Write a protein that binds this DNA or RNA. Structure first.
Ligand SMILES: [Br-]
Lengths: 15, 18
RNA sequence: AUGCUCAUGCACUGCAUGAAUGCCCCU
RNA sequence: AAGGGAUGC
């Protein structure tokens, strides 16, 4: 659904 | 580029993980 | 498009909370 | 995209 600290954090290290 | 689904064991392990 | 996934909380829907063991082996 | 394993000595 919406971004979360966890998913966001993942996206970062993941980016 | 991969995901991995948390299972009953993985989660159980983590639950016990302090 | 992790803008997920998956648990737990009196519809494969909400809400809230937590987990990168969300591993590693295998079939 | 499905299943199993803590003897995962
Ligand atoms: Br295998």
């Amino acid at each position: 659904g919406k971004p979360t600290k966890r998913s966001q954090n993942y996206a970062a290290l993941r980016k």
